[PDB]
Chain A
Amino acid sequence: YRAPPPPRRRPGPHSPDPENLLTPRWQLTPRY
């Protein structure tokens, strides 16, 4: 077998969508 690729996180800025219900409130604060 060949080992699975090492996990890689998504890089760069990610802006949460305010309208989305799932996104938490703290991610929408001006401090964020």
Chain B
Amino acid sequence: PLHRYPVHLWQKLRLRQGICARLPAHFLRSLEEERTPTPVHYKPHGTKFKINPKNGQRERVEDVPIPVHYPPESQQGLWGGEGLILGYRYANNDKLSKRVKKVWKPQLFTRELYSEILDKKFTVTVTMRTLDLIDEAYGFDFYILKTPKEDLGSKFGMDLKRGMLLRLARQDPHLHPENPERRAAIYDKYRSFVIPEAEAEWVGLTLEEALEKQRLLEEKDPVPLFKVYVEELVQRLQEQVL
């Protein structure tokens, strides 16, 4: 036969049914929403018009994004949107020259950054672009919190964001231990990102982790039918007394 829904809608149906529906609304919104990462290696067409070939007249234009590969190591590091470009090159930037298989490597680094919220210095893989963003963000903690997941391009950074958001949300004394006065300043300094504790927990969680977490939340030990009947019997007897 023929499937009523196309294959791509199968993923949508799965998300709309089962434990996926029972997932927290705040987390579901974060997963559902998609934000484009900031372009770094390609620019969209400046002009919106160009000459159509067949008619020889001005026409609307379209944009072809350059392919950029972001390795999982970026998800374990803090890259500022830089990525590996895999493809072919024409030597000397002229079409008349030979085609050479080329892998374009942005300069990668491992560096240490201080987090005021976590009161710890983290040594992580980073690029020069990220370092400028951190300075522009007015602090490493700001960059993690301010930058969105796609622009951040780091699962660990999102995981760091999850920890930072929860730390801000709970006003946990873990921040700057033995310095309550200093702790308040950090919370006040990063007060903008204070959010409900429930939302902060699910920030950056992977789909497999989220499904297991929701399953663990909803898993409950079997009820002894003796207790269930006791509660039912008391309710009926209590109603009878009325």
Contacts and interface: CB of A to CB of B under 8 A. Distances in A.
A21 interface: yes
Contacts of B9: 21
Contacts of A21: 5, 9, 12
Across the A-B interface, give the 3 residue pairs with the lowest CB-CB distance, nearest first: A21-B9, A21-B5, A21-B12
Interface in B1-56: 5, 9, 12
Contacts of B5: 21
A1 B225 CA distance: 65
Interface of A: 21
B124 to A, nearest CB: 42
A21 B26 CA distance: 23
B16 to A, nearest CB: 9
A1 B199 CA distance: 68
A21 B12 CA distance: 10
A21 B17 CA distance: 14
Interface in B93-115: none
A12 to B, nearest CB: 28
A21 B9 CA distance: 9
Nearest to B16: A21
B52 to A, nearest CB: 21
Contacts of B12: 21
Nearest to B9: A21
B153 to A, nearest CB: 30
A21 B5 CA distance: 9
B7 to A, nearest CB: 14
A21 B11 CA distance: 13
Nearest to A21: B9
A27 to B, nearest CB: 17
B60 to A, nearest CB: 15
A25 B9 CA distance: 14
B13 to A, nearest CB: 9
